Symmetry: C7
Subunit: 140 residues, 7 copies
Amino acid sequence: DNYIYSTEVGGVGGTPFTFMQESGTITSIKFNWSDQYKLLHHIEVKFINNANIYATGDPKGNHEVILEIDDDETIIGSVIGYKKGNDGRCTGVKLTTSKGKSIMAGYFEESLITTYTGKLAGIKGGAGSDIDRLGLIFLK
Amino acid sequence: DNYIYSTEVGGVGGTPFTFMQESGTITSIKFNWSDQYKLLHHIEVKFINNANIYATGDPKGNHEVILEIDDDETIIGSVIGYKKGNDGRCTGVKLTTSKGKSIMAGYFEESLITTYTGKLAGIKGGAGSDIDRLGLIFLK
Amino acid sequence: NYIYSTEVGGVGGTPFTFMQESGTITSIKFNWSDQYKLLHHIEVKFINNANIYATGDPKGNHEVILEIDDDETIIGSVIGYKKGNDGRCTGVKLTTSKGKSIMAGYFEESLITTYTGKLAGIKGGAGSDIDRLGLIFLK
Amino acid sequence: DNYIYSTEVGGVGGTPFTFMQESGTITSIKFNWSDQYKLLHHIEVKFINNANIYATGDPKGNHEVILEIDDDETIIGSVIGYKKGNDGRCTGVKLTTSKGKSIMAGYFEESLITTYTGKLAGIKGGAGSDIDRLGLIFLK
Amino acid sequence: DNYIYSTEVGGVGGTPFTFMQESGTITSIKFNWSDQYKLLHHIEVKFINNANIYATGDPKGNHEVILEIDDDETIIGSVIGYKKGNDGRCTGVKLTTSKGKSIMAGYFEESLITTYTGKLAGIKGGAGSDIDRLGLIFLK
Amino acid sequence: DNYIYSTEVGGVGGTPFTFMQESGTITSIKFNWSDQYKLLHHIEVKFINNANIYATGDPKGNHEVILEIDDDETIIGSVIGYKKGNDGRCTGVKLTTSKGKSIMAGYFEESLITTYTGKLAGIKGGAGSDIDRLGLIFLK
Amino acid sequence: DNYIYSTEVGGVGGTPFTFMQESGTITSIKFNWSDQYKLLHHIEVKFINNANIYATGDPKGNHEVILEIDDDETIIGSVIGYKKGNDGRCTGVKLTTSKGKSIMAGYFEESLITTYTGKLAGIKGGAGSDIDRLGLIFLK
Ligand SMILES: OC[C@H]1O[C@H](O[C@@H]2[C@H](O)[C@@H](OC[C@H]3O[C@H](O)[C@@H](O)[C@@H](O[C@H]4O[C@H](CO)[C@@H](O)[C@H](O)[C@@H]4O[C@H]4O[C@H](CO)[C@@H](O)[C@H](O)[C@@H]4O[C@H]4O[C@H](CO)[C@@H](O)[C@H](O)[C@@H]4O)[C@@H]3O)O[C@H](CO)[C@H]2O)[C@@H](O)[C@@H](O)[C@@H]1O
Ligand SMILES: OC[C@H]1O[C@H](O[C@@H]2[C@H](O)[C@@H](OC[C@H]3O[C@H](O)[C@@H](O)[C@@H](O[C@H]4O[C@H](CO)[C@@H](O)[C@H](O)[C@@H]4O[C@H]4O[C@H](CO)[C@@H](O)[C@H](O)[C@@H]4O[C@H]4O[C@H](CO)[C@@H](O)[C@H](O)[C@@H]4O)[C@@H]3O)O[C@H](CO)[C@H]2O)[C@@H](O)[C@@H](O)[C@@H]1O
Ligand SMILES: OC[C@H]1O[C@H](O[C@@H]2[C@H](O)[C@@H](OC[C@H]3O[C@H](O)[C@@H](O)[C@@H](O[C@H]4O[C@H](CO)[C@@H](O)[C@H](O)[C@@H]4O[C@H]4O[C@H](CO)[C@@H](O)[C@H](O)[C@@H]4O[C@H]4O[C@H](CO)[C@@H](O)[C@H](O)[C@@H]4O)[C@@H]3O)O[C@H](CO)[C@H]2O)[C@@H](O)[C@@H](O)[C@@H]1O
Ligand SMILES: OC[C@H]1O[C@H](O)[C@@H](O)[C@@H](O)[C@@H]1O
């Protein structure tokens, strides 16, 4: 195959999403999260050479972070916080890049995945009011 | 054009501004901010081979920082603090350069972007009494 | 064709061996509790094999997953345990050739710092808890 | 024109000074400052191959620091503390060199500039009872 | 004669042991120690290409550590804690390897040796209820 | 001709001294200082291939430090503490060498110089009961 | 002749000792010290290719440290604590080696020397009940 699919962590809930393009990798990713519910609620992605925003979940949280990614820039560290099980949720993300940039969204009070690394190509999971489930997708 | 436009973060308010000159990159950037309102209020920029000062917003704040940038010097780290939403504002900036220089202006109490990196060429956004909206522009 | 790291913990539980000629370990998951301060359950996936190999009882309130690139090795590895006949594994720390690390469970009694290299399988004893755990590496 | 002029920071007050010599770069720089007023008061400079001492301001402060600079030694980091506006003053300086030497004079309670870097050739500004205004000058 | 013998530290007590094999170097070493007596009590060693476990002392302590050693891996730091004199004992060990592995057993409340370094080939000393005396053996 | 004279810091008092030899560099330097007066009182220097001690001031202090300097060893960092003005004194010294050796004598409660660097050749200043004034001398 | 003699620090008391052998450098050195008197009391040295133990002073202290030194291993840092004057003593030693090994014996409450560096070949000084005086000897 062309792509590495990291494990989707969290619950079975929400509307499914899959954001990926062969015409370009992820150039921007935004996480929205709340202190009220200590969850991720909403994620937006942009791809190289495309102004259109791909969004999932409900932007109801009181914080957001954006990581912008240079064309030649990779994810060298990547950690997702979540509550496990059928009624699980994603609670937080830490990404670190080949250029020393990092972002930190939300909370890490239960379970963690340390994911595959590489060129971030897309995301996949389930979202409604919250991010139920998140899986990263990388190139080779 | 043949430039990278970082996302404009903050609100829709203020008078639009675009500071860019074909005959050069940014050589000096000044941020004015207040402890009263915890916002950026005013930005001034100078370009290589141009003694003109390009200013936006109202210099009402009680603090200022200036970063001066050598001709061969790049931004390798860059973070803008902001309040999100239609009535948003820029609250702070942290820049770090290829030569270990850094500045820190204002506050980081809600949302952050970690932007693209490279040769800082210009800025763009909206300002009135405050900096409503700010986006960096880099060369390729 | 393999290096067997020492199995640490008790003599209890049903014996298990997870290894495949088909590939190395691509994912490992540890489940542990704050109630009992033990590892309870481990799942492993191998390269080119969609089967999940599981041992123990996933009753704990925490889990961690490490995913491992095909060319990625373990360069540091520490297992916490209670020693003796009624011993248990209490925790794991792994660190990889690509700067990734995980930490599961507790380290309140005994430690092994294991051999290093390409993680190929695991071996030990499990029931309600992980009684005994040993890593297996390639040469 | 074959020199880099860093921004003069502080007020419009004081008697203007320019210390620069065709004979060489700066070999010694001394800052005098007070805890009473939390200001720089006085600066002395010596140049390569020149026994003359160039002084400005009033040496009334209770502290002084001297940086001596080897012929081949550059400033790789430089920060000036100041009060901004017409009635402004310089409050402090931090210099760091290509050889791991640093100095720190005075206070940093309001505004900062992170200046250009390079071979320090001269200084320029305004002084009376205090250092009103200071700007560094570097070679290329 | 083509081995380096580190000093045996501790007392003259216990039954003498030497763990060394022509068959290879040490691949595993285990230290057992107590908080009750703040002593090492028991040591087990395994060698390359030899399934036999060599043990000395009484495993009565409430802690144990194992260091496993790759075939190509050396000791680059090594410190043994002991009580000196005829009635001495080994109280603790810190070993650090060419691959950034380290272990720490027991206590360091009186005397220390920082030993020779290299490929750990064997150990030698005296043990009964406690480890009376310990000496490391390296290759040349 | 081919020596660098660092600034003499401290007061105008004391008996003048100048210790230098064309035949060789400083191989040992000793500082004596007191907690009573928080001053340097006495300095001794030895030169390469010469057992004779060159001394100034009064060894009345309750502490001494010696730095010994290998033939190929340089000073890469050097800081003298002093009280400024006509009735000034040297209060302390920190030296750091090309081989990671450092010494620290006395107190730093008023003024500092960070001196030139290089091969320490001699010293020069004024001493009586105290070290009134000290300047380092380096080669090229 | 082929040796560097570091300064003997401490008092004039005790029986003089010189430990040196031309058939090898120091392979082991032991320092014995007390908390009672805060002094070094006793030193033992072994040389390469010589099973004889060379000892001076009275082993009455409640602590000992041993450093073992590989054939190719040098001292890169070395500090001796002492009381100065005719009735002086050595109070402590810190050695650091080319292989990252270090030891620390006794106390450092008055005077320090940072000695020459290199291959430790011998020691020299005066001892009775205490180590009155100690000086290191290095090769070239
Ligand atoms: O770049 C951002 C933005 O800039 C331009 O838009 C701006 C904004 O719409 C707005 O900016 C000015 C206001 O900023 C904040 O809202 C406040 O600082 C506000 O001050 C009023 O409210 C404060 C909070 O309580 C209060 O402390 C102030 O005193 C003030 O309220 C008093 O004064 C105002 C004005 O004089 C009166 O209208 C009020 O009634 C009130 O006075 C009463 O109460 C007082 C206190 O008790 C009392 O002393 C007095 O006697 C009275 O009883 C700021 O006004 O508005 C700007 C209009 O100039 C507007 O330009 C645009 O460029 C936009 O595009 C851009 O995004
Ligand atoms: O580099 C800066 C600047 O330098 C040159 O310009 C300067 C300035 O114009 C100015 O600098 C000195 C003055 O700085 C401040 O204004 C004050 O620090 C001022 O001191 C007065 O105020 C102090 C704070 O209250 C006070 O502590 C002082 O005592 C003083 O006030 C007393 O003395 C003044 C002068 O004699 C009187 O006018 C006051 O009434 C007061 O005296 C009464 O009250 C006293 C206190 O209670 C009491 O003891 C006394 O008995 C009386 O009752 C500083 O003087 O002025 C400088 C002139 O020396 C001038 O050079 C230029 O180079 C410029 O370009 C540059 O920017
Ligand atoms: O590696 C070291 C050494 O090992 C081998 O040699 C060892 C030693 O000779 C020795 O090691 C075990 C002893 O260690 C310490 O000395 C003590 O822990 C000692 O226990 C006695 O003392 C303790 C501290 O006071 C005490 O808590 C213990 O109860 C015990 O003292 C009681 O029991 C002993 C033995 O039964 C009696 O003799 C005492 O009188 C006392 O009993 C009375 O008091 C009790 C406390 O109140 C009370 O309960 C009771 O009713 C009575 O009134 C450890 O024995 O001895 C080892 C033998 O086991 C020996 O192996 C060799 O290999 C050697 O070469 C090596 O160097
Ligand atoms: O694993 C803990 C424990 O679980 C159950 O009690 C049984 O399977 C035991 O054999 C085992 O030791």
